[PDB]
Write an enzyme that holds these catalytic residues in place. Structure first.
Site, PDB file in Angstrom:
ATOM      1  N   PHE A   1     -52.255  -5.380  45.713  1.00 33.34           N
ATOM      2  CA  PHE A   1     -52.620  -6.534  44.910  1.00 33.34           C
ATOM      3  C   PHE A   1     -51.675  -6.702  43.726  1.00 33.34           C
ATOM      4  O   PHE A   1     -51.169  -7.809  43.460  1.00 33.34           O
ATOM      5  CB  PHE A   1     -54.081  -6.353  44.481  1.00 33.34           C
TER       6      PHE A   1
ATOM      7  N   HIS B   1     -67.587 -11.716  34.198  1.00 30.85           N
ATOM      8  CA  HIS B   1     -66.278 -12.235  34.578  1.00 30.85           C
ATOM      9  C   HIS B   1     -65.974 -13.525  33.853  1.00 30.85           C
ATOM     10  O   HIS B   1     -64.862 -13.698  33.360  1.00 30.85           O
ATOM     11  CB  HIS B   1     -66.224 -12.404  36.100  1.00 30.85           C
TER      12      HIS B   1
ATOM     13  N   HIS C   1     -68.404 -11.957  40.447  1.00 33.18           N
ATOM     14  CA  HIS C   1     -68.361 -13.354  40.004  1.00 33.18           C
ATOM     15  C   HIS C   1     -69.623 -13.732  39.251  1.00 33.18           C
ATOM     16  O   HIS C   1     -70.407 -14.590  39.663  1.00 33.18           O
ATOM     17  CB  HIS C   1     -68.095 -14.268  41.188  1.00 33.18           C
TER      18      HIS C   1
ATOM     19  N   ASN D   1     -57.434  -8.592  35.412  1.00 35.63           N
ATOM     20  CA  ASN D   1     -58.067  -7.263  35.404  1.00 35.63           C
ATOM     21  C   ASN D   1     -57.069  -6.101  35.473  1.00 35.63           C
ATOM     22  O   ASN D   1     -57.226  -5.141  34.692  1.00 35.63           O
ATOM     23  CB  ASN D   1     -59.042  -7.097  36.582  1.00 35.63           C
TER      24      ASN D   1
ATOM     25  N   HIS E   1     -65.591 -21.751  35.069  1.00 35.26           N
ATOM     26  CA  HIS E   1     -64.692 -21.801  36.237  1.00 35.26           C
ATOM     27  C   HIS E   1     -65.247 -21.169  37.497  1.00 35.26           C
ATOM     28  O   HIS E   1     -64.725 -21.468  38.581  1.00 35.26           O
ATOM     29  CB  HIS E   1     -63.300 -21.219  35.939  1.00 35.26           C
ATOM     30  N   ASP E   2     -66.277 -20.303  37.379  1.00 36.09           N
ATOM     31  CA  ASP E   2     -66.902 -19.667  38.543  1.00 36.09           C
ATOM     32  C   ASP E   2     -68.405 -19.865  38.558  1.00 36.09           C
ATOM     33  O   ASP E   2     -69.102 -19.105  39.265  1.00 36.09           O
ATOM     34  CB  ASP E   2     -66.572 -18.162  38.622  1.00 36.09           C
TER      35      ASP E   2
ATOM     36  N   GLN F   1     -55.411  -1.936  45.686  1.00 38.35           N
ATOM     37  CA  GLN F   1     -55.061  -2.305  44.309  1.00 38.35           C
ATOM     38  C   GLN F   1     -53.560  -2.299  44.097  1.00 38.35           C
ATOM     39  O   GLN F   1     -53.015  -3.220  43.457  1.00 38.35           O
ATOM     40  CB  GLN F   1     -55.713  -1.361  43.289  1.00 38.35           C
TER      41      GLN F   1
ATOM     42  N   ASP G   1     -57.705 -15.222  35.029  1.00 38.37           N
ATOM     43  CA  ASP G   1     -58.524 -14.917  36.191  1.00 38.37           C
ATOM     44  C   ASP G   1     -58.013 -13.667  36.904  1.00 38.37           C
ATOM     45  O   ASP G   1     -58.813 -12.835  37.411  1.00 38.37           O
ATOM     46  CB  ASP G   1     -58.423 -16.141  37.133  1.00 38.37           C
TER      47      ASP G   1
HETATM   48  C1  LIG Z   1     -54.665 -14.430  44.761  1.00 36.91           C
HETATM   49  O1  LIG Z   1     -54.599 -13.251  45.572  1.00 36.91           O
HETATM   50  C2  LIG Z   1     -55.768 -12.703  46.018  1.00 36.91           C
HETATM   51  C3  LIG Z   1     -57.022 -13.278  45.852  1.00 36.91           C
HETATM   52  C4  LIG Z   1     -58.162 -12.639  46.335  1.00 36.91           C
HETATM   53  C5  LIG Z   1     -59.529 -13.248  46.136  1.00 36.91           C
HETATM   54  C6  LIG Z   1     -59.953 -13.297  44.664  1.00 36.91           C
HETATM   55  C7  LIG Z   1     -61.333 -13.883  44.589  1.00 36.91           C
HETATM   56  O2  LIG Z   1     -61.808 -14.786  45.233  1.00 36.91           O
HETATM   57  O3  LIG Z   1     -62.071 -13.221  43.670  1.00 36.91           O
HETATM   58  C8  LIG Z   1     -61.249 -12.242  42.978  1.00 36.91           C
HETATM   59  C9  LIG Z   1     -60.130 -11.942  43.960  1.00 36.91           C
HETATM   60  C10 LIG Z   1     -58.905 -11.432  43.210  1.00 36.91           C
HETATM   61  C11 LIG Z   1     -59.077 -10.016  42.735  1.00 36.91           C
HETATM   62  C12 LIG Z   1     -59.560  -9.721  41.468  1.00 36.91           C
HETATM   63  C13 LIG Z   1     -59.718  -8.407  41.035  1.00 36.91           C
HETATM   64  C14 LIG Z   1     -59.348  -7.382  41.891  1.00 36.91           C
HETATM   65  O4  LIG Z   1     -59.404  -6.044  41.610  1.00 36.91           O
HETATM   66  C15 LIG Z   1     -59.844  -5.698  40.291  1.00 36.91           C
HETATM   67  C16 LIG Z   1     -58.852  -7.679  43.178  1.00 36.91           C
HETATM   68  O5  LIG Z   1     -58.530  -6.603  43.945  1.00 36.91           O
HETATM   69  C17 LIG Z   1     -58.000  -6.860  45.246  1.00 36.91           C
HETATM   70  C18 LIG Z   1     -58.706  -8.986  43.581  1.00 36.91           C
HETATM   71  C19 LIG Z   1     -58.034 -11.421  46.980  1.00 36.91           C
HETATM   72  C20 LIG Z   1     -56.781 -10.835  47.147  1.00 36.91           C
HETATM   73  C21 LIG Z   1     -55.646 -11.474  46.674  1.00 36.91           C
HETATM   74  O6  LIG Z   1     -54.415 -10.894  46.854  1.00 36.91           O
HETATM   75 MG   LIG Z   2     -63.018 -18.751  41.229  1.00 37.40          MG
HETATM   76 ZN   LIG Z   3     -62.704 -16.245  38.517  1.00 33.51          ZN
END
Ligand SMILES: COc1cc(C[C@H]2C(=O)OC[C@@H]2Cc2ccc(OC)c(OC)c2)ccc1O
Ligand SMILES: [Mg+2]
Ligand SMILES: [Zn+2]
Ligand SMILES: COc1cc(C[C@H]2C(=O)OC[C@@H]2Cc2ccc(OC)c(OC)c2)ccc1O
Ligand SMILES: [Mg+2]
Ligand SMILES: [Zn+2]
EC number: 3.1.4.53
Lengths: 326, 325
Positions: free
Chosen positions: B285, B77, B73, B234, B113-114, B282, B231
């Site tokens: 996710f 980003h 963050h 990635n 935003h962050d 991943q 957001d």
């Molecule tokens: C909305 O759903 C979720 C939100 C969150 C928290 C988010 C946060 O606060 O910062 C970023 C996080 C999202 C994220 C970004 C890139 C990633 O990998 C490149 C990744 O990997 C797991 C997860 C985690 C898990 C979730 O399922």
């Molecule tokens: Mg945020």
């Molecule tokens: Zn963000």
């Protein structure tokens, strides 16, 4: 100790609508919030239930009371004490007997006590339109109400002020959530949505075999507490006329001081805030007809027939203000 | 080395910009250089009479309020989300939907935003009784703070990039930016996705395939979902980029888990370095969050998101192949 005797006699009315809250403010040395909260906590056995040390309760209440502005005519410690006491009477209504837990009761009374703390005497719209620090911190969203919560909770961290020190972690987490949900619902811009939801609940209400309201999920329970505190907050026109008229004088003073700041800044003056173009009596009749009576008639339906005398007083006071217009 | 940086910045309109290279070549100023490039590409300085020195001063100050010791963050980003929003705003199906002020609001929102993110989650901030959670009553704690910082920095000397907007323009922009950034709170994901699915089910289009969004409510919901997709973009990027983002979020998660361990709290999902499965996490996710979201986006803008969705599915297949039987 004579003054103390007179104060104690007046506090005997703490369970009654129409308590002499201004007389209590004088007799208590400008500590209406502290003495009414302490009396209510004793009446409800809350110090014993929650193992609250008496010196910690008094220390917190005095500090909370200090953070209401003694120089604002309406949103001061007397209004906070009045909303606390009004919520306490509403919580005792027969339709709600044994409905709420001790933690929910504590949350509703604590929320009422903090609900306007550190109010500057101007509205959210004024704070937004003047680019205030408060509106910058809170992104124009429930600006005052978020601030009242943050102050009310921050003060628990001062020396000998943590009145919740003996609650369990789960009790503290639940209380915190309920207090936030209640105070944020006192944002005046939420009134219409809050009332629409209360009307839905009345239309669909369920009553137990004991005759009391059935509230079997958090959403319904918190909605009733939110509307209870919002009714307490909007209760001035339901009180005996000599109390109501003092509240009208006080809110008009605060409104006109805001209008004077708006005028000096070249802003359009907010409704009811222009002391050169004001109709106090028409404004009270409109307030009752469009806001306070719709809300209280709905609350009275929820708890029928428990609030009939309150609604009757509101209607009489509407008739009185109307009779001054012609 | 501004020549190589200019070459890299010529890709500003493409999904897959080499944002880490840009971060390196700009002396750790990707947010400033990418925002400036986008503002030029969209003619936003002329349209809103933004003095270029004010733009740069604000961008550098804002960039400085991203933490350099947070692995994910940070300003990279922020720059990535800005540039991803910029590409999404150019989706053919969205042509003529958004006004110039709405475009400005979506890009500014992405930039801020962050900002000032401390590298831990809202739940961490709530459960540690942090000052931020006390200020914001446990509700969108981080996102309210990012907005408050992003707007407060406009008040620094020579930072008011909006000085020549009209009064109504400034009010409207502020409301839209708030609505967008608060929607980036991760706990709101399902609600936003629901809104998006409804918009797909009820979507009105021209005979060309272009979205017609008559009311503000629908347009702000599209912009909220757009910045949320950016957001969460990635895993839809070229794999070499995606794998760097995974390394960074896992470092940040594990540091939160280390603080949680040292404070003896329960370790949040994906945050226990002694118990983690990066690749399974991943795939999960993508399967539960990113793909449902981006497939719905792709339905809304059909068929303009098909290449992005293609990349996402390729990257999912790759990460799955890294999990042994
Ligand atoms: C909305 O759903 C979720 C939100 C969150 C928290 C988010 C946060 O606060 O910062 C970023 C996080 C999202 C994220 C970004 C890139 C990633 O990998 C490149 C990744 O990997 C797991 C997860 C985690 C898990 C979730 O399922
Ligand atoms: Mg945020
Ligand atoms: Zn963000
Ligand atoms: C929710 O509806 C409204 C809200 C408001 C703003 C409220 C506020 O911020 O502080 C108190 C104000 C309510 C109020 C209390 C006592 C009054 O008279 C004793 C009174 O007179 C007009 C108005 C104004 C008008 C409204 O209709
Ligand atoms: Mg209030
Ligand atoms: Zn109040």
């Amino acid at each position: 100790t004579e003054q103390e005797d007179v104060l104690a006699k007046e506090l005997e009315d703490v369970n009654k609508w129409g308590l002499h809250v201004f007389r209590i403010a004088e007799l208590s040395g400008n500590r209406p919030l502290t003495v009414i909260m302490h009396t209510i906590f004793q009446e409800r056995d809350l110090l014993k239930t929650f193992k609250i040390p008496v010196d910690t309760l008094i220390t917190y209440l005095m500090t909370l009371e200090d953070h209401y502005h003694a120089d604002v005519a309406y949103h001061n410690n007397i209004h906070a004490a009045d909303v606390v006491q009004s919520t306490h009477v509403l919580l005792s209504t027969p339709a709600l007997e044994a409905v709420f837990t001790d933690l929910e009761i504590l949350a509703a009374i604590f929320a009422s006590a903090i609900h306007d703390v550190d109010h500057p005497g101007v509205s959210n719209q004024f704070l937004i339109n003047t680019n205030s620090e408060l509106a910058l911190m809170y992104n124009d969203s429930s600006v005052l109400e978020n601030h009242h919560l943050a102050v009310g909770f921050k003060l628990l961290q001062e020396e000998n002020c943590d009145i919740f020190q003996n609650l369990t972690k789960k009790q503290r987490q639940s209380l915190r959530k309920m207090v936030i949900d209640i105070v944020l619902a006192t944002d005046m811009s939420k009134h219409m949505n809050l009332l629409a939801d209360l009307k839905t609940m009345v239309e669909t209400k369920k009553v137990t075999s004991s005759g009391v309201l059935l509230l079997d999920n958090y959403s319904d329970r918190i909605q009733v507490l939110q509307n209870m505190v919002h009714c307490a907050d909007l209760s001035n026109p339901t009180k005996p006329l000599q109390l109501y008229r003092q509240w009208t004088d006080r809110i008009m003073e605060e409104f006109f001081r805001q209008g004077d700041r708006e005028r000096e800044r070249g802003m359009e003056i907010s409704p009811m805030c222009d002391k050169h173009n004001a109709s106090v009596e028409k404004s009270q009749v409109g307030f009752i007809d469009y806001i306070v009576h719709p809300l209280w008639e709905t609350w009275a339906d929820l708890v029928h027939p428990d609030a009939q005398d309150i609604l009757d007083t509101l209607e009489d006071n509407r008739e009185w203000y109307q009779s001054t217009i012609p």
